[PDB]
Structure formats: C-alpha cells, structure tokens
C-alpha cells in the first residue's frame, strides 16, 4: 500500500467528493469528474487518514464530515 | 447503517 498527501485549494465550493465509512475507516466513494477532488489527485477507494493534521483514521463518519468541512486543505490518504 | 456524504 501507498500513502499520498493531497492538497485541495479551499474555494468555498464543493470539494467534489463523497465519503463512506467510519466507526472501519473513511473511504472516498465518488469523485466528480469536474470537481476539485478529481483535479487534485483524489480517487475512489482512497482511505482518508488525516485532514489538515487531524487523525481521522478511526473517526466517526460525522467526525470525518466535520473535519472535512469545518473551517488550502491537506488530505493524507492510503492507496493500494 | 450506511451513509454517503457528498461534500
């Protein structure tokens, strides 16, 4: 497995993704072809490990949702 | 059970 650091420039618009899982793990389920997530390297199946340094490895689904949206955003993901 | 959150 591989780990990558993704960077999405916060623009007050749709980040361009959808996530599933939590309490095991938050995985990206959809990536808009025209969205920010697709333009910045995100892919379906990636596990979100950290949101701007906050560890979301074992975060609840809503814990991850707040981290993602609560106010450039850095996502560290695991990818196989 | 399952949630999909569009952000």
Q: Is A57 helix (H, G, I), strand (E, B) or coil?
A: coil
Q: Would you identify the CATH topology of the domain A2-79?
A: Pdz3 Domain (2.30.42)
Q: Name the resolution in angstroms.
A: 2.8
The closest of A66, A72, A57, A71 to A23, measured between CA atoms, is: A57
Is A3's Cβ below 8 Å from some Cβ in B?
no
Contacts of B2 in chain A (CB under 8 A): 20
Q: How far is the C-alpha of A56 from the C-alpha of A68, rounded, in Å? A: 10
User: To the nearest 5 percent, what fractions of chain B are helix, strand and coil?
Assistant: 0, 45, 55
Is B3's Cβ below 8 Å from some Cβ in A?
yes
Domain residue extents for chain A: 2-79
Q: Which residues contact A16 (CB under 8 A, 6 or more apart)?
A: A31, A32, A34, A35, A36, A37, A38, A39, A42, B7
Is B7's Cβ below 8 Å from some Cβ in A?
yes
State the method.
X-ray
For residue A70, the chain B residue with the least C-alpha distance is B7
Cross-strand pairs, A5? A76
């Amino acid at each position: 497995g591989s780990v990558e650091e993704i960077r999405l420039p916060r623009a007050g618009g749709p980040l361009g993704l959808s996530i599933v899982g939590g309490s095991p793990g938050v995985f990206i389920s959809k990536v808009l072809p025209r969205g920010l997530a697709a333009r910045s390297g995100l892919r379906v199946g990636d596990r979100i490990l950290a949101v701007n340094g906050q560890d979301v490895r074992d975060a609840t689904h809503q814990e991850a949702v707040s981290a993602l949206l609560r106010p450039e955003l850095s996502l560290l993901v695991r990818r196989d | 059970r399952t949630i999909e959150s569009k952000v």
